[PDB]
Every structure is written in structure tokens, then in C-alpha cells.
Amino acid sequence: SMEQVAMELRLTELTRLLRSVLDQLQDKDPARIFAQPVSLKEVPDYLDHIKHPMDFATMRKRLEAQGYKNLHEFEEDFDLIIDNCMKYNARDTVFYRAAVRLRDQGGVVLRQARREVDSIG
């Protein structure tokens, strides 16, 4: 149907916007601490601690399959990155501190993304 096509164009355009958001958030992680999944070879107990691991590569795979229906779903995955790190790692670690900085800097980006998603529809 033509309606299904229109919905698909909307999803495509959301995906374009989320790709730009993802690029901007990932620039706030210049150390690449959140770039890839935590390695279960290197941290074998991880899944005993963290039940829903997340990282920017995994988000990018979902994004490119157009698997984010709305901004809330995308933000859920970004918050997992941060929140997982802040639980597994202690306050005095470079990992925790990187997550705080990513949260703080990403907030700005996400605030305007929400306005754009609402504005453009």
C-alpha cells in the first residue's frame, strides 16, 4: 500500500536522524571505551553482573537494520551503555568516569534530537 510506503519513508528518515545522533554521541567517547561489547573472554563473569549488555557497535547494527521505531527505543539502548558501566565499575575508575562524561555531554545532543523528532514528526 501507499500508506506502508509512507510509514517506511518516515522510518528511513528517523534512521537518518538517529545515525547523526549516534555519531555525535560516539564522538563524546574519544577513548572508545563504549565502542564494542564487553569481551566475555576477558570479563568471563560479566553476564552474572549485567543482564542486558550494550555498546555502540551493537546499536549501530540495530540502527542499520532500521530496528529503532522511535527515539525512546534508541535512548533506552544509550542509557544501557552508561548505566551498565556505572554498576560494573567503581566510582574511582576511568570506565565509570567516562560514562559520567558521556551521559553529561550526550544529554545536550539528545535534548535537541527530541525536539527534531517531534518538530519533523
From Swiss-Prot:
Superkingdom of the organism of origin: Eukaryota
Limits of the Bromo domain: 9-113
Transmembrane stretches, start-end: none
Location(s), subcellular: Nucleus; Chromosome
Numbered residues of crosslink Glycyl lysine isopeptide (Lys-Gly) (interchain with G-Cter in SUMO2): 41
Tissue note: Highly expressed in testis.
Quaternary data: Component of some HBO1 complex composed of KAT7/HBO1, MEAF6, ING4 and BRD1/BRPF2. Component of the MOZ/MORF complex composed at least of ING5, KAT6A, KAT6B, MEAF6 and one of BRPF1, BRD1/BRPF2 and BRPF3. Interacts (via PHD-type zinc finger domain) with unmodified histone H3. Interacts (via PWWP domain) with dimethylated and trimethylated 'Lys-79' on histone H3.
Function statement: Scaffold subunit of various histone acetyltransferase (HAT) complexes, such as the MOZ/MORF and HBO1 complexes, that acts as a regulator of hematopoiesis. Plays a key role in HBO1 complex by directing KAT7/HBO1 specificity towards histone H3 'Lys-14' acetylation (H3K14ac), thereby promoting erythroid differentiation.
Name of the protein in question: Bromodomain-containing protein 1
Residues of the full protein shown: 555 to 674 of 1058
